[model samples]
Target: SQSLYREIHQLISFKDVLPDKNLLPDWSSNKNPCTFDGVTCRDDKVTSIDLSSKPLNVGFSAVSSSLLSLTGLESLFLSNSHINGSVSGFKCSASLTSLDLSRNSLSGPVTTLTSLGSCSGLKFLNVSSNTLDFPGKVSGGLKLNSLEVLDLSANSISGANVVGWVLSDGCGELKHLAISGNKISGDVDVSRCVNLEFLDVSSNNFSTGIPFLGDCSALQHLDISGNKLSGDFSRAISTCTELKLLNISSNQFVGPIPPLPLKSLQYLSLAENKFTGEIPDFLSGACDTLTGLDLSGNHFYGAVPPFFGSCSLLESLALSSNNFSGELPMDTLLKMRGLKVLDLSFNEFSGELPESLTNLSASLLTLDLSSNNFSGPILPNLCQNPKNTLQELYLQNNGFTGKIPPTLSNCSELVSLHLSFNYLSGTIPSSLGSLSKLRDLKLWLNMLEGEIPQELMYVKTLETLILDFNDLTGEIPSGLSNCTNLNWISLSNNRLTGEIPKWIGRLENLAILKLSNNSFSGNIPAELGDCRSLIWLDLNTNLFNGTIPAAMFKQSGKIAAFIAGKRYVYIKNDGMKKECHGAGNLLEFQGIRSEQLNRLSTRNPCNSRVYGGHTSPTFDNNGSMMFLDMSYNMLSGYIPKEIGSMPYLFILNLGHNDISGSIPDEVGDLRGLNILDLSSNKLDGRIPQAMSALTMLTEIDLSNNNLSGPIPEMGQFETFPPAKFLNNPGLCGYPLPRCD
Candidate 1:
């Protein structure tokens, strides 16, 4: 103990090294090193030094060798420091056992740890999170007699051949070893360490089968995720029963995941793997004992098994992006008292949401049920007592109907709310303003009608506000501009009438603004150009007739592009395809591939108001318009042939207006056109057989007024949907069952 007193005294002197400043005020000023910062002594002998996060910045040169030679030193922790240098001077001591130097800048070959072999008592050694370069860096053929914990995580230590390499070092006595974030690969032999209790070799390029650990019955934690580790897990993990945590995610494991019998297991993440087959009911039992379970991004299919009810203590559950189907298991809901985050999105579940789900434990924070067939209204009383804790809620693309309840205002903790593409109706709830912490509010489509709620202005944290379509009325709420944090605003359709608010530019973060359709009058806001962050500007229709600010020309394509793609175009003919077949309303079909929106009809992309645009959205207008149904309106004069030239044009309906002009032959170029309605006007001309060029066309209506034409059976017109040619006076087509 007396010898330790002198050695430790010198070690404390270097604690305040010029390079790595000490955390405490020069405790090294005293000769009594035992009293110094980070130094703990027993009976005048230096026993331990814990300097985990003191921001010490020093190098090995400043370290006194005598300090490390201290005979009684047991544990030394220097994590989260700025220590740099080859680890050295580990003197042999009968008591020297544990040393932690994690989260530092120490770099070089780890072979320096071989110097620690002098301390036969060394058991735990943590040199993790440094710049350790090679797995072979540690010395060979040297047995660390009593070594147990060896952590070399977060380094460049390659796992490529580490299994066999580490075995040669004879780590049989080690109980915990972490070599993750490395580049290890090759024949699996790290399993030779029969005494291994914890092994983490994740984030490597391991391609062979899992190494066999020599009967590590005491193994409690294993993480081999983010690697190419492959095999049926039944064999490898079967030998690990005391395991408390298992993360085999992002691997190439295939087939039904083997069950683990470890009663101590509490956390498991098998997501992003290739595991297939019905989710075993046994996993539900596994969940019952777990606090966290993530099976996302897997091939696991079949309905959520009732076995989920066994997981009464499950706190976090993620089953997203899987083939799991069937009505959500109500049994699981009734029993999970500790459930917090539930993500069953991107699955094929159908049926009404169980009302009893509202009785779930109040600790829930996130609930995502998007992309499912769940119909009916949300459970009104679903939120818990601490509504502020609910951070995320996603229920988009479901069959859910009914008005948003005002009781939802109680969810003060709600951050992101997405109810887009649902049958939701009623006024945009002013009660939503009560959600002071709300960040995103997306309620597109549905039959909801009413004015935009000024109460929403209370949510100053709003980042994205997408409310286009529906029968919303009144003018843009002036109070909305008060939402200083607003970044994206899209209230395109509805009967909104009035001037574009000048205060809109006050929102410095405003990135996109789409107030199309509505009867907004007066000159377009030139001040809007001041919003430098503005990406999209679509205020079409309305009374905004004046020229846009020159500044508007500078930025374009600010919003996500919706390339128009028509899976099935009804040329006023195809009497077959389901009307509004795609997802509710054409908004989802707006932009470039708006036609592609038809594919999402299963998601209900239709039930919304037509976005009225006073000024064309400042995008690639020269680009083809997927949908140009400006028909049946007061729009007059010669048709902007530019509308037909958009190569992406899917629907071209300029019919039912006071336009008096000959049909432009350019209409023949609409190769992708599905429906072409140009009837009831004072225009006369012979039909261009070139019109037959619309190969993808399905319907073409050119009736009444002054159009004379012999039918050309080329593109869509020849397909013969009668409704297309019925009213066309001088037109003849197969829809008439015969061209006349």
Candidate 2:
């Protein structure tokens, strides 16, 4: 006891005092060390010490040398602590059977493990989530039959020299081994561990033929995902016949998936691979026991055959994002009585959906059939009965036409219903509001007409209400404020007419509000500024009038506005105003191939994406208005100086408005401004010389304005084409005739 008390302080050093619950507050020579956390004591000897997750700024030497006093210690765990330095001179007791130093910064060669020769009783070791190196020890080995679980994942241990170092020790008793997330590569030989039941070798640089696991029948789980392994999988598991779950996703496995010899196989994933030809008939081998199967993100062609009809207990199956075509084999799907989840999206399957879809088992929960060529009217009773237990339904991007059936209101359990990108016409049935569990109601890109019913307020759980790109008319229902959970309200590109509802400010969770390209006319509501979560606000191309509301910019800390919606080809129009007439002309992209998705611009028409219309703009964590586009409106007001508060402004367009007054110098404070278009406005003032500070200005248009003065020649101003400064008679610059 006297020696233990004297050495406790020497083991750890805190750069600053930590909380009482964290660092050992009771640790002192004045008190018993056993009472401190992570310290297990038997009799007078220390049996274990775990200072993991503590704020100790010490090295491996400080921790290792402290254990020299406690020879009876059996376990030590110090993960996620700021531990660093090489692990040299670690000579623990033979009673030390467990050690966990994961999530640290210990570095050394494979010989570092040899330092634990005194700990022959070590049964479990986890050095994962660290920076440990495996230097100069290729053939270097050890001997241990007691080592059962070894976790060397999330480390830098790699190369041929360290490949089989663990097995070279004649350790045949390993039951679980996790060497994943490392740099180790080359041929791996795990044939000796016949008793191994679990192995994870994912996220490595393994590019050779599959590692041979000799007679590993006891292996129940094996994960080799995220590697470069290729070729047929026949010889990979020739001897292993008891695998319950196998994952080889994100690899280059070719040819039809090999037959599974294990009848007990329940979960299998081969997603994101290059496997071709028809899905194997051998899939029936696991039909009696398999529960989940994932084959998405592959190049699998041919028909999506009903090969799993015999899998009566099957619960989940995913075959999305593939090239499977032809009418689905609906007859084969009805046999799976326990099917709960089915995804057939992003495929080319055509023709009308089979009537047999309503016959799916009562346990069906999720049905995703988006981005397909399925046609014809949707079956009125698609869920078989009103009592069906479906939760999510995604059927967008199909050729289906006709009225949205009123029978859909019977799906009471639905949480998300997306039916956009279809030719469906007719009024939105008022019966849908009765679905108490509905959350997301997306019906964009359709011919739906008539007013948005006031009955929809009954769905108190509604969050996203997207009804854009339609011919709908009439005012927004006054009772919609009752559905308080609204976050995304997109009603753009429609024929709707009504005053912008003031009750919208009550929706505290509203993030995106897009009412563009419509006949919505009224004063921009000052109450909208109350929404602290509002990130995007687009009121462009509308009939809105009255002065710009100053209250709106008060809450514009972070704003992102996708300025244009029509397909517009961007041109700088440098100088020669006549060279580029109509600065914001709408163009048409006839055949933008799917593979050229990278060429897409946010400037395209709002809610006109190839997927489901209304595209979601990814917002960055920013402070101040990121986007504000009220262009082509009848709005009239001086450019508010409060716009300077939006330091992260990306795009600002007030073009073609009746806006008057001098351009505010506050605009120059926006250092991050990208595209600023105040063109075609009746503004009069000398150009603010402070604009020269906008070094990141990518595109700017100040043409057709009543402004005078030589254009600022510093920074990005001179880089623009003369067309941006055209029609301003008082402005003189190098691009136009010299100023008088």
Could you say which candidate leads in TM-score?
2
In model 2, what lDDT does residue 176 have? 87
* TM-score, every prediction: 0.66, 0.83
In model 1, the runs with Cα more than 4 Å from the true position are 1-74, 88-97, 118-121, 135-145, 190-192, 262-265, 281-288, 361-363, 381-391, 445-448, 460-464, 468-740
TM-score of 1: 0.66
The TM-score of predicted model 2 comes to: 0.83
Local accuracy of candidate 2 as per-residue lDDT tens digits, 76-189: 888887778766656666778888888888887746766765577888888888877676447757445578888889988778635577778765788888889988887767
lDDT of 1: 0.66
RMSD of 1: 12.3
Model 2 clash tally, residue pairs = 15
